[PDB]
């Protein structure tokens, strides 16, 4: 068992009202069974595309979830991951400044 690391970042510079793509990169988890959700204001985004499960030279699993989004002044975006290595789901919120 290995705990998943989560990173949330956008494809383009974020500008309020301008369509963009939100990325969620999940890595370092074992075994490969994982549930990844992308949320807008705590509610599950329906159109989320996932890459094919792959792994690194050191056998560390990695997956990239991405979605189309329009950043705003009032909306919160997050990536929630559920994995057996964790007692609770891990949610990491998009912070355009980090």
């Amino acid at each position: 068992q290995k705990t998943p690391q989560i990173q949330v970042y956008s494809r383009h510079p974020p500008e309020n009202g301008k369509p963009n793509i939100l990325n969620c990169y999940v890595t370092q988890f074992h075994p490969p069974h994982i549930e990844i959700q992308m949320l807008k204001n705590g509610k599950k985004i329906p159109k989320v595309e996932m890459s094919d499960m792959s792994f690194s030279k050191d056998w560390s699993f990695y997956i990239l979830a991405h979605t189309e989004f329009t950043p705003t002044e009032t909306d919160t975006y997050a990536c929630r991951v559920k994995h057996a290595s964790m007692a609770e789901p891990k949610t990491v919120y998009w912070d355009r400044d980090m």
Partner: protein, 272 residues
């Protein structure tokens, strides 16, 4: 450039299993093969490499026979020796070759068991690797008895991989050398210290992967620049961020400089 066929297999019980695979040439995915799919899919227009349709079909047929035979073998290997914990079983296979300039290559076939590097193929046989549970010696001895399978793996590592991968490399050369320009943007987060600020330089959309990102005070490189990990984009371009810890007031005059092969010598210089 490393050519690698990555297989992820999961055995939940004596009946239920799923095996999913993909093929990467460098950092570009060239093939896909999900459990329910009977045929391998191309994820690039150049994924057939320099193979003819008859040559590709023979390569695909071999994989089809192998996937059923692999599943059947692991199942047999588990049933013949109850290893106290029979299920769940997690297997990772990585096989291909590292491409070196001048038609030279080094082939490999590595296996992880329950997330840890367990077995390799060298010469004509499977060898348990340092750290793998010793009881794996028995299924490794059973597998090594099959000289026929061993000859195919030898064919695979000595002939199939170096020849298919060189052709793939040739047909994919222009894609692996395409230049995508990075776009940079800046932000800051207050640091865990009063009058301390973390400066963030975000760099996205560049291709190929080699890049240089540094926080500067004119000609002086700020040694405190910490490069994050390379993060993928869905379009297979790259993202990276470089941070700098500064004292409040010291931001003024600082710039983020990015050197990328796609810009010529015209570096991005973005002032705070």
């Amino acid at each position: 450039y490393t050519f690698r066929c990555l297989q992820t297999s999961s055995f939940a019980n004596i009946s239920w299993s799923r095996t999913d695979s993909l093929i990467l040439l460098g950092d570009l995915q060239t093939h896909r093969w999900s459990n329910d799919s009977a045929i391998i899919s191309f994820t690039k227009p150049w994924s057939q490499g320099k193979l003819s349709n008859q040559q590709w079909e023979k390569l695909q047929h071999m994989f089809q026979v192998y996937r059923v035979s692999f599943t059947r073998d692991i199942q047999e290997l588990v049933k013949m020796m109850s290893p106290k914990e029979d299920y769940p079983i997690e297997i990772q296979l990585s096989t291909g070759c590292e491409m070196y300039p001048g038609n030279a290559s080094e082939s490999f076939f590595h296996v992880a068991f329950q997330g840890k590097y367990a077995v390799r193929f060298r010469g004509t046989s499977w060898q348990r690797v340092l750290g793998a549970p010793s009881w794996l010696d028995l299924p490794i001895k059973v597998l090594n008895a099959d000289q026929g399978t061993s000859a195919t793996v030898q064919t695979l590592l000595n002939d199939t991989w170096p020849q298919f991968a060189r052709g793939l490399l040739e047909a994919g050369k222009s894609d692996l050398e395409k230049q995508e320009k990075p776009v940079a943007w800046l932000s800051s987060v207050p640091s865990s210290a009063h009058g301390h600020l973390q400066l963030v330089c975000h760099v996205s959309g560049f291709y190929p992967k080699p890049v240089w990102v540094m926080w500067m005070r004119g000609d002086q490189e700020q040694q405190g620049t910490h490069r994050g990990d390379f993060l993928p984009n869905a379009d297979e371009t790259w993202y990276l961020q470089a941070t700098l810890d500064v004292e409040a007031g010291e931001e003024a005059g600082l710039a983020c400089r990015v050197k990328h092969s796609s810009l010529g010598g015209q570096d991005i210089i973005l002032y705070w």
